Design a protein around this motif. Structure first.
Motif, mmCIF file in Angstrom:
data_model
loop_
_atom_site.group_PDB
_atom_site.id
_atom_site.type_symbol
_atom_site.label_atom_id
_atom_site.label_comp_id
_atom_site.label_asym_id
_atom_site.label_seq_id
_atom_site.Cartn_x
_atom_site.Cartn_y
_atom_site.Cartn_z
ATOM 1 N N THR A 1 0.832 -1.201 0.000
ATOM 2 C CA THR A 1 0.000 0.000 0.000
ATOM 3 C C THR A 1 0.875 1.264 0.000
ATOM 4 O OG1 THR A 1 -1.792 -1.226 1.025
ATOM 5 C CG2 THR A 1 -1.846 1.215 1.227
ATOM 6 N N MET A 2 1.933 1.309 0.802
ATOM 7 C CA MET A 2 2.907 2.406 0.738
ATOM 8 C C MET A 2 3.536 2.537 -0.664
ATOM 9 S SD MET A 2 4.927 2.392 4.373
ATOM 10 C CE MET A 2 5.776 3.889 3.908
ATOM 11 N N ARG A 3 3.846 1.402 -1.279
ATOM 12 C CA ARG A 3 4.495 1.436 -2.585
ATOM 13 C C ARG A 3 3.571 1.988 -3.700
ATOM 14 N NH1 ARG A 3 9.397 -0.430 -3.753
ATOM 15 N NH2 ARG A 3 9.420 -1.964 -2.014
ATOM 16 N N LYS A 4 2.309 1.583 -3.692
ATOM 17 C CA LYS A 4 1.320 2.138 -4.600
ATOM 18 C C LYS A 4 1.265 3.642 -4.438
ATOM 19 N N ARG A 5 1.251 4.134 -3.187
ATOM 20 C CA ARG A 5 1.170 5.583 -2.967
ATOM 21 C C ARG A 5 2.439 6.299 -3.477
ATOM 22 N NH1 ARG A 5 -0.144 8.758 2.791
ATOM 23 N NH2 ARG A 5 0.444 10.816 1.904
ATOM 24 N N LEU A 6 3.600 5.748 -3.196
ATOM 25 C CA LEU A 6 4.893 6.298 -3.628
ATOM 26 C C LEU A 6 4.931 6.422 -5.156
ATOM 27 C CD1 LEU A 6 7.976 6.786 -2.915
ATOM 28 C CD2 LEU A 6 8.321 4.341 -3.319
ATOM 29 N N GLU A 7 4.501 5.370 -5.833
ATOM 30 C CA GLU A 7 4.646 5.317 -7.298
ATOM 31 C C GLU A 7 3.635 6.262 -7.970
ATOM 32 O OE1 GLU A 7 7.122 4.361 -8.726
ATOM 33 O OE2 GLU A 7 8.096 2.989 -7.272
ATOM 34 N N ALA A 8 2.621 6.698 -7.223
ATOM 35 C CA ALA A 8 1.642 7.661 -7.704
ATOM 36 C C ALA A 8 2.079 9.086 -7.266
ATOM 37 C CB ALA A 8 0.261 7.309 -7.166
ATOM 38 N N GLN A 9 3.342 9.221 -6.828
ATOM 39 C CA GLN A 9 3.911 10.449 -6.200
ATOM 40 C C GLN A 9 3.014 11.093 -5.137
ATOM 41 O OE1 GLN A 9 5.696 13.067 -9.120
ATOM 42 N NE2 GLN A 9 7.358 11.564 -9.379
ATOM 43 N N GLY A 10 2.447 10.219 -4.311
ATOM 44 C CA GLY A 10 1.535 10.582 -3.297
ATOM 45 C C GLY A 10 2.138 11.000 -1.966
ATOM 46 N N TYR A 11 3.453 10.937 -1.809
ATOM 47 C CA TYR A 11 4.120 11.419 -0.553
ATOM 48 C C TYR A 11 4.772 12.775 -0.821
ATOM 49 C CZ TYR A 11 3.524 6.704 1.504
ATOM 50 O OH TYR A 11 2.966 5.518 1.981
ATOM 51 N N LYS A 12 4.190 13.825 -0.266
ATOM 52 C CA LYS A 12 4.656 15.229 -0.505
ATOM 53 C C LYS A 12 5.887 15.595 0.310
ATOM 54 N N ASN A 13 6.142 14.874 1.414
ATOM 55 C CA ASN A 13 7.331 15.078 2.243
ATOM 56 C C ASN A 13 7.632 13.791 3.024
ATOM 57 O OD1 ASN A 13 5.613 15.079 4.649
ATOM 58 N ND2 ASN A 13 5.002 17.117 3.953
ATOM 59 N N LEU A 14 8.793 13.754 3.686
ATOM 60 C CA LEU A 14 9.216 12.586 4.458
ATOM 61 C C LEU A 14 8.314 12.311 5.640
ATOM 62 C CD1 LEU A 14 11.338 10.295 4.990
ATOM 63 C CD2 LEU A 14 12.627 12.065 6.212
ATOM 64 N N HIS A 15 7.765 13.359 6.234
ATOM 65 C CA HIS A 15 6.848 13.214 7.321
ATOM 66 C C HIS A 15 5.688 12.308 6.928
ATOM 67 C CE1 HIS A 15 4.943 13.825 11.109
ATOM 68 N NE2 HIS A 15 3.856 14.309 10.524
ATOM 69 N N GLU A 16 5.086 12.526 5.765
ATOM 70 C CA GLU A 16 3.930 11.710 5.352
ATOM 71 C C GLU A 16 4.299 10.207 5.218
ATOM 72 O OE1 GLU A 16 2.191 13.421 1.785
ATOM 73 O OE2 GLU A 16 1.359 15.088 2.922
ATOM 74 N N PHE A 17 5.492 9.959 4.692
ATOM 75 C CA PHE A 17 6.007 8.605 4.476
ATOM 76 C C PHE A 17 6.268 7.933 5.845
ATOM 77 C CE2 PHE A 17 8.370 5.419 1.977
ATOM 78 C CZ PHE A 17 9.301 4.947 2.922
ATOM 79 N N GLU A 18 6.932 8.644 6.737
ATOM 80 C CA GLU A 18 7.158 8.122 8.106
ATOM 81 C C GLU A 18 5.859 7.812 8.838
ATOM 82 O OE1 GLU A 18 11.316 9.969 9.702
ATOM 83 O OE2 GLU A 18 9.808 11.489 9.369
ATOM 84 N N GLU A 19 4.814 8.632 8.639
ATOM 85 C CA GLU A 19 3.524 8.398 9.290
ATOM 86 C C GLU A 19 2.999 7.010 8.859
ATOM 87 O OE1 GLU A 19 1.291 11.986 8.278
ATOM 88 O OE2 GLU A 19 1.434 12.681 10.364
ATOM 89 N N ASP A 20 3.122 6.696 7.568
ATOM 90 C CA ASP A 20 2.608 5.398 7.068
ATOM 91 C C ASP A 20 3.478 4.291 7.613
ATOM 92 O OD1 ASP A 20 0.362 6.214 5.801
ATOM 93 O OD2 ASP A 20 1.082 5.860 3.747
#
Length: 121
Positions: free
Chosen positions: A58-77
């Motif tokens: 699920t994180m990877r799908k979001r990443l590949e859709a450029q869905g993480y605007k900053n590192l904070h959002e990625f760390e939250e997931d």
């Protein structure tokens, strides 16, 4: 506009950093406990317990859709992956212990990622 394409260049290069980070995180999970969503067929009560499920695919799908605007959002997931497991599974379980271990080892990777995101911009 050109500035939209420089920011898109910013998002794009954040995505390249985040992909490497995700791959390094997902290497700290050789058992593949966190690779896919918890199955609602096998744990039909899961959503009574966990309000925001997360997993690496699920994180990877979001990443590949450029869905993480900053590192904070990625760390939250990534923190949801850990935190959901430590709530749902008891302290004396293989699941809970795999999450502790992922958290510990991931912290090192994330500490250097925060320095790269600040440093490179």
């Amino acid at each position: 506009s050109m500035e939209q394409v420089a920011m898109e260049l910013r998002l794009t290069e954040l995505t390249r950093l985040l992909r490497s980070v995700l791959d390094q995180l997902q290497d700290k999970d050789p058992a593949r406990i966190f690779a896919q969503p918890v199955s609602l067929k096998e744990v039909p009560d899961y959503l009574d317990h966990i309000k925001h499920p997360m997993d690496f695919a699920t994180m990877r799908k979001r990443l590949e859709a450029q869905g993480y605007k900053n590192l904070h959002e990625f760390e939250e997931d990534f923190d949801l992956i850990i935190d959901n497991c430590m709530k749902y599974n008891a302290r004396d379980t293989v699941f809970y212990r795999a999450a502790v271990r992922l958290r510990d080892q991931g912290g090192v990777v994330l500490r250097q990622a925060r320095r790269e995101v600040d440093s490179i911009g």
